[PDB]
Design a protein around this nucleic acid. Structure first.
Lengths: 58, 56
DNA sequence: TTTTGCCATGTAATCCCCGGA
DNA sequence: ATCCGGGGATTACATGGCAAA
């Protein structure tokens, strides 16, 4: 099982800025964003997945 | 890669005609009766629905 | 026709998407 | 983060069927 991580405030600000433009990730955009933030792609994919579900519930 | 016998395919097809989606129960029961693993029966149903959509 | 021998098609399986729990 | 249980897109590969001397 993949470890849970905590995102820094800079990572969360960049993620959210991104989610504000498009709630879905293409492959290239995921790679770029994971590389830029120093995050595993699975963590990024996961954050977007959970954020869609939180905002759908909100 | 497994190849299903004509008897298995005949039964799978008749089951598919009656209900194109398996319940857990029916998947278990079908697999037991046919001598197949549940993943193979589940995969057959998945591929059958895809194949049909891919026609129209 | 035979007897190869390649390739096209079929399909079981894999990969990855998604929402929901 | 996990897993399930859909989907679409492919991929690997067995084999049927055609090609050809």
């Amino acid at each position: 099982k993949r470890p849970r991580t905590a995102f820094s405030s800079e990572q969360l600000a960049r993620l959210k800025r991104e989610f504000n433009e498009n709630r879905y990730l293409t492959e290239r955009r995921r790679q770029q964003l994971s590389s830029e933030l120093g995050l595993n792609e699975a963590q990024v994919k996961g954050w977007f997945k959970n954020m869609r579900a939180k905002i759908k519930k909100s």
